[PDB]
Chains A and B, each alone.
Chain A
Amino acid sequence: GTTYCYSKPDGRPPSTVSDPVTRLGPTLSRHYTFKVGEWPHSQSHGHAWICPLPSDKLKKMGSFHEVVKAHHLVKNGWDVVVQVNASFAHSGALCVAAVPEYEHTHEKALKWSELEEPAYTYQQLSVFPHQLLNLRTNSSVHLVMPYIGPGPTTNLTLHNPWTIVILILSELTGPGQTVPVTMSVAPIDAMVNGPLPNPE
């Protein structure tokens, strides 16, 4: 099922740039596929894989990466599908949310990491656009998020509006092996501004 975070994406150009805006078509900002990590039996509720979008993986976003890299500002949404590979004998559940302006990260800024959420946060993470990933019912979460930020566009080098939080609510039990967490990310309605110099 598709969950829209706050609203559907738009292709409107930034109100605050009087310079040419380049609309990256789908064949240019393609789609990228990552393995987020492995969910083990030892990890406990509250543990979360924090995936700011993108910033530590921008370098692995091929085409999109090349274009973004050469320009100063970017406005764009994302289409993400988080999956899990578990058997029908595995028990457990995650909550995967899309958080605007997520922060905690002890300035390991814009790096995909793992942390232990503080209770009132894991209890209430459902207050942000999300989907539960119960191991007895489903294996995927699909979230589509619009561009969001204090201004009409940003510099992805200094700001990551959206960050995906995959959080353990019910620990993994059942067969001894781990459950790999997987994620596909596709930039959506990307618009780019002001070309930067040649890299000499």
Chain B
Amino acid sequence: VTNVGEDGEPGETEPRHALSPVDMHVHTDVSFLLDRFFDVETLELSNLTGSPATHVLDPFGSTAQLAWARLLNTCTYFFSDLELSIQFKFTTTPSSVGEGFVWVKWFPVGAPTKTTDAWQLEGGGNSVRIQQLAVAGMSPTVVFKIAGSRSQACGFSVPYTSMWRVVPVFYNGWGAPTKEKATYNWLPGAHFGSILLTSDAHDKGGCYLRYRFPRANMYCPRPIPPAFTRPADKTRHKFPTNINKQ
């Protein structure tokens, strides 16, 4: 009704002159936001010996009070590639480790996983045994030493290996014919694969896993959960900040 300004008639609104651009919406770009390293997960090393289990790279159903957790939960289907940074931080005395090789093995979505120490290295009496699936071969094996290491880390890029054209972040159905409470929001292979960290350190320290998601694509936006509580009616939340009145 009437539309634009200053007569005050019913339905009439005053003039507004829209602002000019400046930032160009570059920062709200989906793939820009996800192409950075995020500290998601922290994990323990397995001993060289025994029958270790692989850790699945699935950052999807998180509750973590971190920016990547909510963000990954903003869409229904997701596709992206992956980059990893694995670091190693001592939890004991750094002089406990004189060599400290760490074998990292990455497995594509669908890879077989049973391993037991099976590859023997021999030298002057004593010997060392590594896992059947830690050896360098078909899938990537990375070996880094923690001892004098200036960064006690490694890192590499890996692609989207799932069989699904897109990863369902939410799934209204079951991933298996038997409908068990377990297979509910499920679907097999909705992830990035799995890794196996193995080392004579294992005690002595842990890791720090960071994910970077290059080439991200999101489908079907979903509600974004709050992050903070609701302040009192008619008030404003007040947070500590850079700006703030001294």
Contact = CB atoms under 8 A, between A and B. Distances in A.
Interface stretch (A30-38, A101-109, A183-191): A101-109
Contacts of A125: 223
B224 A124 contact: yes
Contacts of A161: 172
A102 B225 CA distance: 15
A100 B221 CA distance: 10
Contact of A158 (B179, B221, B224): B179
B220 interface: yes
B166 A101 contact: no
Contacts of B224: 120, 124
B226 interface: yes
A115 to B, nearest CB: 14
A151 interface: yes
Contacts of A150: 77, 164-168, 171, 187, 190
Interface in B206-235: 220-226
Contacts of A160: 172-173
B181 A158 contact: no
Chain A: interface residue count, which band? 20 to 34
A6 B221 CA distance: 10
A72 B167 CA distance: 22
A121 interface: yes
Select the residue from B76, B166, B167, B225 with max chain A CB neighbours within 10 A.
Answer: B76
Contacts, number: 70
Contacts of B223: 120-121, 123-125, 127
A110 B173 CA distance: 8
A107 B181 contact: yes
Interface in B172-194: 172-174, 177, 179, 181, 184-185, 187, 190
Given A124-B224, A163-B172, A109 B166 contact: no
Given A103-B170, A110-B172, 15 more contacts: A100-B76, A100-B170, A101-B76, A101-B168, A101-B220, A102-B172, A103-B171, A109-B173, A120-B224, A120-B225, A127-B222, A127-B223, A128-B221, A150-B164, A150-B165
Interface of B: 76-77, 164-174, 177, 179, 181, 184-185, 187, 190, 220-226
**Ranked 10 nearest A-B pairs via Cβ:** A159-B173, A124-B223, A101-B170, A150-B168, A150-B164, A158-B174, A158-B173, A101-B172, A101-B76, A100-B76
